[PDB]
């Protein structure tokens, strides 16, 4: 009854593909509001160049520079 084990390392899981994120060409962005009931006045944020993106301290919308966004890598941070 000894059969040759089939090693299926294929494990597919999609952790969603749509977070509230805006692609910017400027490291300094002017934020103003958000989604749902999240809203705040115009503020100026600075995206860390060695980090790639920055989250708003008020609203859950995250901002990322186009260079870090158009990278064909798995940015696995959609939901925790």
TrEMBL record:
Listed name of the protein: Zinc finger CHCC-type domain-containing protein
Species the sequence originates in: Cereibacter sphaeroides (strain ATCC 17023 / DSM 158 / JCM 6121 / CCUG 31486 / LMG 2827 / NBRC 12203 / NCIMB 8253 / ATH 2.4.1.) (Rhodobacter sphaeroides)
InterPro entries, A to Z: Znf_CHCC (IPR019401)
Taxonomic superkingdom: Bacteria
Residues in Zinc finger CHCC-type domain copies: 27-63
């Amino acid at each position: 009854m000894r059969r040759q084990p089939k090693t299926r390392q294929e494990s597919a899981r999609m952790s969603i593909e749509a977070p509230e994120t805006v692609v910017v060409s400027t490291w300094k962005v002017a934020c103003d509001g958000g989604e749902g009931a999240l809203g705040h006045p115009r503020v100026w944020l600075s995206i860390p160049h060695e980090t790639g993106f920055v989250e708003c301290g008020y609203c859950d919308r995250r901002y990322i520079h186009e260079s870090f966004a158009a990278a064909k890598l798995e940015h696995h941070h959609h939901h925790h």
